[model samples]
Target: GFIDDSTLTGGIYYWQRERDRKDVTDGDKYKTNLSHSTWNANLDFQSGYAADMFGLDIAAFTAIEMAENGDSSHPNEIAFSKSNKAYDEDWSGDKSGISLYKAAAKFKYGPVWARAGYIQPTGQTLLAPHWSFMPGTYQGAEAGANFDYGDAGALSFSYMWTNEYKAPWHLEMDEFYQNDKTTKVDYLHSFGAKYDFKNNFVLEAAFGQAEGYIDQYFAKASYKFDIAGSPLTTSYQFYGTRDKVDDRSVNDLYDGTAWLQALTFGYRAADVVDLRLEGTWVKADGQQGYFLQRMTPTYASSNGRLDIWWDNRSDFNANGEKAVFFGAMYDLKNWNLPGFAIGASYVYAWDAKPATWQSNPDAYYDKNRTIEESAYSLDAVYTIQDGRAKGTMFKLHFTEYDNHSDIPSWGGGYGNIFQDERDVKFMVIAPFTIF
Candidate 1:
């Protein structure tokens, strides 16, 4: 029976965040402090294939606001409605109800598989599902196939088409729209492929486009090898976007060709420590810089994840920007801690100038200014490896960001990149199986 081979799983998620921003002194002086906390529960069910060809998958998600200490003036982007006015009115009201996030029908045969209905899609280049307490959902269909050539390695291909999407915090589906929120997009199409070589090398490429809106392309190459008994890895990635329509309003941000390139290297030392170094370069032929998102039409809340390094507070994708990141991690398994680890990272970015500065100096707050910024972060995690809480996990993260330039803040002026702030977050996850 399908019920006998089916599985049921669930999890509990809790998250809390605290933020402090620099004080402002203009006509009036004020201080900024924001805090957020929430709890979420999720249940997922997957049925066994009937005749080994078809199956069903369903998921339900719900979230409750435990505490919120800020108004719509400076709201957090993690959870709650996109409208600050609506969120402030019903900060902890009846918005935390359960909803069916996924109800997809699946099909499989040998090396081919497909799913249709409300699903969560991945492995694409352009658009990505946002994740907070629970992942976002898409009303769409996806298909893919995998081929193993044995000695020649393996290759995979996938395609996705979506009409509507639900944000990570929102409970209802909404149509795709541009930054203006008035000009709607018909749909999105994405195609992706990956190949794995037998010699520890991999290559991937993807293309995506929104109807009469924009086109995006991505490619990556990676290789892994051993250096003196230690593992070494290197990768290079490219992302570019082109605008299809020309509407030069402030809301219409995309223009010309905006592209970014990233190079990354990682190495393991002494089997107990890991080190990483990454560099990123970007160029935009528009006034608003490079935007890498298809939905939630704003440069402030980009939905793309291709950039190698940057904290949640900043993307560092401004026009003519150069950035570098360095990080290190240490494992504490040998010190009587089986599933504990700690890590730290630093990022430095400089030389960011909008492309419109030379052509139209009045469009910028400071015509001859270049923005510079930096940030440092610390992280710690612990996961239970045995007993009843085998799958339980705990995590803590902190980031301090600084703006060294005098170009003003994001909303204050035009040449501003990021605000000076300190952010801290803690999360806990507990999972269980009920078969």
Candidate 2:
């Protein structure tokens, strides 16, 4: 947006979480030590006059959960914040105020634009994840326009009517649309384009569709390279969902179709190491397995009532879908350790086809859902290299999940994960700038 430039910004974020879960085939246990904090403010106004067109933006967000002592059977980490409305939805559980996660309004000319109330929409990896304290929105209304072939690449399109979704742990204003039967989806049509061909090649693509009741299609593509000097990235993603349930009800989970592939590599190898490597794979074939992941914060509110936090459960008799993930990162920036970083990750999920062994669906291994899952994570981060707490940040993380399914039932036969977990996290983040 261009028109006289006006600005006001703000930020403050904090998070802490500790969790330990052990079932070991029925010893059943859970624990949590949590904390969440947030405060964000923004306002942009552009309107120099008729010649400049119009533009005005607004944002005011607040979050709180200084401390929560685990209850609700120890795993309701206060939905992680949104000011903890006690997990809203007419929650008379009391206390919820100081709202406004976002409130949008924009109009422009010359490049054509339009926006309407509470927004945050864009494709590729779809939404969900703004790191703790709050972030998730879509209250509808959008029209897009942007095209330029200047150096030869640019295009965009949008048509949305969302009208629901304001999950910041619910009730800040409540909405979670869908009309009655859960598993939502609305008219959202998006498209994109980007090209910058030449020895420095670059290409991008994004696609989207969301129809009523349950019909979704998503897509993404990417290619980037610099080669010799070190920089490589590759990506491909697709998601499909179907459900208009008429009798297709077998828990109506999240009728699915999914595929994902990603590759990444980056290196500095010089003045103090900086390297990154990544790999990922996911395959899901609609029998409602793998449900298009993006959000499933520990079974959001016991699942059901759409507004993003997925996990609808399809009973682990998986007929299709599998998973894998890999990661690595190390940055020592100019050595001598300034703002150091280190991380590692690994995850795996196994074959599908066992819902109580389906009466020897395949005999011996009992048809196919021999289930397998393994996960690992480790990381350390430190930032603060001079002056006024120079971008202060300190963190540590550890995670573990191990399961070799022999399904019992914690709602077993399953969805997401229902056994063995461990996590340890610590952080102190201080970031600020207000003007």
Candidate 3:
């Protein structure tokens, strides 16, 4: 029990929300309010061994109704005109069993630290973070270090890896999910560095390769310069390739070549508010139907057509579609309510149209000639004033979806020859966290 700095921290979050769904078939709307529970807990350990031998950190987390807040996609899958219906079940278990969120052992000597265990991969989240209440985790190793560059100042580096598809058990609702039963397998890697300059300026960068799972890179740098008497932060985030709907199948074949590149700029005006502007240039790989799809992974590409290796195109979009987002946050309560802070933001998924619909009769597919989809969300939150309840907070929100396609084709079964319209109109959200 010999250690200098050691501590334990966690959070409990709660949410209450209403959802409205509108169908194009009859232009009818369905209203539903989630009266559910959502919460998670974590434990961390850190210390040095017998003669300052090594350092260690491990964390385990669990939650109930937790499915509502920290999840990645809609707990109750999406609806497809092909299925004539949407997925069923909302995600439920024995309301027990914990997960290994962050459990790692770190060894340090001089300025470098090496670590290994179960941890989140360092990259753009795999599943949608906004909808992922419970995301897939990985088991891997990573290393971090800091060094001095004399006159150039100092810098740092970090490397990591983890397993994928840990389990679908926690998610009783994902009936179509796939797993490897007895094999604890997956491959992930990351390389990152940061440097500082003499003029109170700093720069950072990172590169990652998640095998066929996540092959992408992200980098951002911010510097502080005083404008008159106030300081400002200017930073940008850039991704690699834009995700196209047609390219969806390409990312499914063999190694599934899927890449993403996005750019984001942010500026902090004051302690009460901050704003950001972001854009993406996704490129979808094309090779479907006919002599194409020979290399595509999705059911359409691999499901049919001759394997003549002829349908290969550098670009996917039959009519090119991209996305853009502008976001803002103001901690008005940071100054107005001291103990309570509040803010909201939104992102519009442009040309988020997937060419995977079964609308084309000539092809037998149901949603073809797909259209672009747009989404909007707003939120409000309140934090407790007491220290014991310090990490506790309540949130209320609403989200809307213009197009909904949750089901994927598995076989040649009629594949829903009825349904035609499914759009998410609105939903309310509430969340509480204890730290």
Tens-place lDDT per residue, model 2, 1-435, is 344555555545555656555644455644332233223322323233234655556665554545554331322233433334222333223232345556676776776677677766542223332323445556665666666766666655555455355555544333232323254443444444444443345555434434544444454455667667565655454444454543434434343444444445445554344455443444444333454433221233212111211011122224343545555657766566868888776666566433332211222233334466667788889888889778878787777666666453333434444556666666666655543
Q: What's the ranking of the predictions by TM-score, best on top? A: 1, 3, 2
Q: With candidate 1 superimposed using the best TM-score fit, by how many Å does residue 49's alpha carbon deviate from the native?
A: 1.7
Candidate 3 off by > 4 Å: 25-28, 31-35, 48-50, 66-95, 121-136, 164-186, 198-203, 210-215, 221-228, 241-259, 287-321, 333-336, 349-372, 386-388, 403-435
Give the alpha carbon lDDT tens digit for every residue of 47-164 in model 1. 8988788899999887777887653233343455643222123434323556687799988899888888988775544556776666777888888899999879899888888887
How much is 195 displaced in model 1, in angstroms? Answer: 0.9
lDDT of 1 at 360: 43
* Cα deviation of 290, candidate 3, in Å: 22
Candidate 2 residue pairs in backbone clash: 316-413, 362-367
lDDT of 2: 0.47
Winner on TM-score between 1 and 2 is 1
Q: After superposition, how far is residue 93 of candidate 2 from its true place, in Å?
A: 24
**CA lDDT for candidate 3:** 0.40
| All candidates: TM-score | 0.89, 0.30, 0.62
What's the lDDT for all of these models?
0.72, 0.47, 0.40
What value does the lDDT take at residue 129 in candidate 1? 70
Query: Per-residue alpha-carbon lDDT of model 3 for 1-435, expressed as tens digits?
Result: 545556555544333333444432344433332223444444555555534557666665554453343322233321111221113223332244466555666677788767666544332222111112333344566677888888878887777654332331232211111112222113445577777875667766665543443344455555667774566545544433221233333232111343344455556667566666655544333322211111112121011111011011011122224545555556655466754444445444344323332222333233233334345455455656566555456555445444333222211112211122222222222223322
Which candidate model has the greater lDDT, 2 or 3? 2
